[PDB]
Design an enzyme around this catalytic site. Structure first.
Site, PDB file in Angstrom:
ATOM      1  N   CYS A 111       0.990  -1.264  -0.024  1.00 42.36           N
ATOM      2  CA  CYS A 111       0.253  -0.238  -0.021  1.00 42.36           C
ATOM      3  C   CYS A 111       0.729   1.294   0.041  1.00 42.36           C
ATOM      4  O   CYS A 111       1.480   1.613   0.977  1.00 42.36           O
ATOM      5  CB  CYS A 111      -1.016   0.096   1.343  1.00 42.36           C
ATOM      6  SG  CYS A 111      -1.965   1.459   1.322  1.00 42.36           S
ATOM      7  N   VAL A 112       1.195   1.956  -1.076  1.00 43.33           N
ATOM      8  CA  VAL A 112       1.660   3.243  -1.280  1.00 43.33           C
ATOM      9  C   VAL A 112       0.571   4.396  -1.244  1.00 43.33           C
ATOM     10  O   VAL A 112       0.095   4.560  -2.352  1.00 43.33           O
ATOM     11  CB  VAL A 112       2.733   3.196  -2.437  1.00 43.33           C
ATOM     12  CG1 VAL A 112       3.533   4.530  -2.295  1.00 43.33           C
ATOM     13  CG2 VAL A 112       3.371   1.979  -2.489  1.00 43.33           C
TER      14      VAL A 112
END
Length: 147
Positions: free
Chosen positions: A86-87
């Protein structure tokens, strides 16, 4: 489609002119499941490690960011139990002009600088904040085991 060309251009550039610490292995028959390896950057709990991930250009790509998955088991705040990365900055700031090279550089950056606010691994997020020496020792120990 014509996007296939646009990615063929960038991916080909990525393999020819790769970012430091990042090697890309696309199969020419499959240009939407991009096998990638990221070396654990020096100075991080992941130093000396070899991290296999896959970059999945979505159905709504490149209007939505691609989804990245670590194949290598890793103890990182932004990586789920399935390996999902998850960026949030990518989610929040995504425009089409961001190349695949940028995503890969961003994922490499996240290894160095996790983001606990949007953590898929609660325990890693907590440890990064509450007790850092303990997050680093576990990330380092798990790097040695799976890196």
């Amino acid at each position: 489609p014509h996007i296939i060309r646009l990615v063929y251009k960038e991916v080909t550039t990525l393999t020819a002119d790769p970012p430091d610490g990042i090697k890309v292995f696309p199969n020419e028959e499959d240009l939407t499941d991009l096998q990638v390896t990221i070396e654990g950057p020096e100075g991080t709990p992941y130093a000396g490690g070899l991290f296999r991930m896959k970059l999945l250009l979505g159905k709504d790509f490149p209007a939505s960011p691609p989804k990245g998955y670590f194949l290598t088991k890793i103890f990182h705040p932004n990586v789920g139990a399935n390996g999902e990365i998850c960026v949030n900055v990518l989610k929040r700031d995504w425009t089409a002009e961001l190349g695949i090279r940028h995503v890969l550089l961003t994922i490499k950056m996240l290894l160095i600088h996790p983001n606990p606010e949007s953590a898929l691994n609660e325990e890693a997020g907590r440890l990064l904040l509450e007790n850092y020496e303990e997050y680093a020792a576990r990330a380092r120990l798990l790097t040695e085991i799976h890196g």
